[PDB]
Amino acid sequence: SPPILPPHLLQVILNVMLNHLYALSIKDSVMVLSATHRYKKKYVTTLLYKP
Amino acid sequence: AKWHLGIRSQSRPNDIMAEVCRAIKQLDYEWKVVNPYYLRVRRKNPVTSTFSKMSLQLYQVDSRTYLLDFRSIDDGGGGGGGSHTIEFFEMCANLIKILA
Amino acid sequence: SVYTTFMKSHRCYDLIPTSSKLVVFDTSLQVKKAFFALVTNGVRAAPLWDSKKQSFVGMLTITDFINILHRYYKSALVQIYELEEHKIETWREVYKPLVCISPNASLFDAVSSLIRNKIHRLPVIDPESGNTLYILTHKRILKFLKLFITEFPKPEFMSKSLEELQIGTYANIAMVRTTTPVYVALGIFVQHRVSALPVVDEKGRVVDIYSKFDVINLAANLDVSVTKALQHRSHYFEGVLKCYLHETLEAIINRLVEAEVHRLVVVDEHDVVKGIVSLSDILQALVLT
Ligand SMILES: Nc1ncnc2c1ncn2[C@@H]1O[C@H](COP(=O)(O)OP(=O)(O)OP(=O)(O)O)[C@@H](O)[C@H]1O
Ligand SMILES: Nc1ncnc2c1ncn2[C@@H]1O[C@H](COP(=O)(O)OP(=O)(O)OP(=O)(O)O)[C@@H](O)[C@H]1O
Numbered sequence: 001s002p003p004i005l006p007p008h009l010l011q012v013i014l015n016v017m018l019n020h021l022y023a024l025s026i027k028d029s030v031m032v033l034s035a036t037h038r039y040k041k042k043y044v045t046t047l048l049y050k051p
Numbered sequence: 052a053k054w055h056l057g058i059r060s061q062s063r064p065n066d067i068m069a070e071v072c073r074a075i076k077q078l079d080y081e082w083k084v085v086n087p088y089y090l091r092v093r094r095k096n097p098v099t100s101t102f103s104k105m106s107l108q109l110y111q112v113d114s115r116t117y118l119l120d121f122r123s124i125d126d127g128g129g130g131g132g133g134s135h136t137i138e139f140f141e142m143c144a145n146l147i148k149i150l151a
Numbered sequence: 152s153v154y155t156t157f158m159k160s161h162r163c164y165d166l167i168p169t170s171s172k173l174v175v176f177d178t179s180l181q182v183k184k185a186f187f188a189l190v191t192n193g194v195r196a197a198p199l200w201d202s203k204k205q206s207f208v209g210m211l212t213i214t215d216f217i218n219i220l221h222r223y224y225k226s227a228l229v230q231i232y233e234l235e236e237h238k239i240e241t242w243r244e245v246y247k248p249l250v251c252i253s254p255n256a257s258l259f260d261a262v263s264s265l266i267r268n269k270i271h272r273l274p275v276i277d278p279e280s281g282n283t284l285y286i287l288t289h290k291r292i293l294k295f296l297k298l299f300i301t302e303f304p305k306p307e308f309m310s311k312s313l314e315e316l317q318i319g320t321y322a323n324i325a326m327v328r329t330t331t332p333v334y335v336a337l338g339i340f341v342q343h344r345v346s347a348l349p350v351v352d353e354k355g356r357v358v359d360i361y362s363k364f365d366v367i368n369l370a371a372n373l374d375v376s377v378t379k380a381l382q383h384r385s386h387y388f389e390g391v392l393k394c395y396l397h398e399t400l401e402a403i404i405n406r407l408v409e410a411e412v413h414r415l416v417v418v419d420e421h422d423v424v425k426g427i428v429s430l431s432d433i434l435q436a437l438v439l440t
C-alpha cells in the first residue's frame with residue numbers, strides 16, 4: 001500500500017510543501033493552480049489563472 | 052480560498068497508477084517508475100526545446116481515499132525563455148484534464 | 152553621487168522580500184475574471200502568460216482596467232457591449248512589449264528602465280528558470296535606498312528646498328472636484344496618464360485624493376461622485392499628505408517613505424495645490440543627481 005501523507009504536507013490550505021501543486025475547486029471553466037518555489041533565499045507563491 | 056493538495060480518488064492504488072500512466076502516454080510525456088507509487092515524468096517543450104521534470108506520488112490519506120501528489124523537480128529546468136514554474140502548472144493542468 | 156553609487160553596486164535580487172505572492176494570467180483569460188482576481192488577491196499587477204508562445208508577453212495593471220472601464224462606459228452609451236467576454240489576448244489585440252529585468256541586473260538598471268519606459272511595474276525575471284520572481288516598484292526602491300544608505304556623507308542637494316531643486320510637476324495639474332462623477336475621473340486618467348487626481352474645492356484647496364488604486368475597488372456603479380466613492384475607504388485615513396516648497400528633499404523623501412504613498416500634493420499656506428511631487432520625480436532626480 002501507498003505511503004501515508006507526511007505531515008506537514010497539508011491536504012488543504014485556507015486563506016516542506018515547496019514545489020507541491022495546490023489547486024482551487026474548478027469554477028466557471030477557469031482553473032487556479034498554486035505552488036511555492038525557491039530562488040536562492042527568496043520564496044514566491046505563484047497563482048496561475050487558466051481557463 | 053480553499054486550496055487542495057494535488058487530487059483525490061477512491062479507486063484502488065493500482066487502478067489509480069494505471070490511469071495516470073495512460074493519461075501520461077496520451078500526452079506523450081516520457082515517464083519513469085521509481086516505486087509502484089512514484090513516477091518521475093519528463094517532457095520536452097515543443098516551442099522552447101527545454102526539458103521539464105516532475106514527480107507523481109500517491110499517498111494514502113484515508114481508509115478509502117488516496118492522494119496523487121504533483122511536485123516540480125528543481126533540476127535546472129525549464130525555460131526557455133519560458134517559465135519552469137508556469138510550465139509545471141501546465142503539465143499538471145493537462146494531466147488533471149485527461150483524468151477527470 | 153552616493154545614491155548613484157549605491158544603485159550601481161546592488162542587484163535587484165537584494166530588493167526581493169524573503170516571501171511574496173505572484174498572480175499570473177493566461178492571456179486566454181476573460182478580462183472580467185482577470186480583474187476580479189486582482190481584487191481578490193490584493194495585488195496591483197499581474198504578469199501575462201501566452202501559452203501558445205510559451206512566455207510572458209506583458210502586464211495587467213489598474214491603468215488597463217481603467218482604459219477598459221472607460222471604453223465599456225462609452226460603448227454602452229451606444230449599445231456596444233463586447234468587452235466583458237473579451238479574453239485578455241483579444242483586448243490587447245484591440246490596441247507595449249514586455250519590459251523586465253534580471254535579478255542579477257543592477258538597481259540602477261531597474262530605475263532607468265522604469266523612467267525610460269514610463270511604467271510602474273518591473274517584473275524581475277530569472278533568465279535561467281525564466282520565472283518571474285517579484286514585481287519591483289518605485290516605492291520599494293525608494294524605501295530600500297532610504298533604509299540602506301548611510302545618512303552621512305549627505306549630498307548638499309538633500310538640504311535644498313523643492314523651490315530650488317524644482318522636482319515635480321507645477322503646471323497643468325489634473326484635478327477633480329468633490330462633485331465630480333467617477334466616469335469623469337476615468338476620462339481624465341485615460342487622457343492625462345497620471346496616477347492620482349487631487350480633489351479640490353471651489354477655491355482650489357485640496358480636501359482629498361482620488362487614486363487609480365481607488366478604482367479597482369469597483370471590480371469587486373460609475374455614476375456616484377468622487378467624494379462618495381471615497382467613503383469605502385478601506386485603510387485608516389489621516390487625510391491628504393502634502394508638502395510646501397520650502398521643505399527639503401530629505402524631508403520629502405522621509406515623508407514619502409514613511410507615508411508609503413506614491414506622491415505628495417504640493418500646497419501653499421491655504422491648502423491650495425501648486426503641484427505634485429511623485430516617487431517618479433524623486434527617483435529621476437536621484438538618478439540624474
Ligand atoms: N513591465 C511592463 N512591461 C510592459 N508593459 C507594462 C509593464 N508594466 C506596465 N505596463 C503597461 O504600461 C501601461 C501603464 O502601466 P503602469 O505600470 O503605469 O500601470 P500602473 O502601475 O497600474 O498605474 P499607476 O502605477 O500609475 O497607478 C499599462 O497599460 C501596462 O499594461
Ligand atoms: N498624497 C496622498 N495623501 C493622502 N492619501 C494618499 C496620497 N497618495 C495616495 N494616497 C492614498 O493611499 C492609497 C495608496 O495609493 P498609492 O497609489 O500611493 O499606493 P499603491 O498604488 O498601492 O502603490 P504604488 O506606489 O506601487 O502604486 C490610495 O488609496 C490613496 O488614496
Ligand SMILES: Nc1ncnc2c1ncn2[C@@H]1O[C@H](COP(=O)(O)O)[C@@H](O)[C@H]1O
Nearest residue numbers: 319320324325345346347348427429431
Ligand atoms: N494630478 C496630476 N497632474 C499633473 N501631473 C501629475 C499628476 N499626478 C502626477 N503627475 C506627474 O506625472 C508624472 C508621473 O507621476 P506618477 O503618475 O505619480 O508616477 C510625474 O512627473 C508627476 O509629477
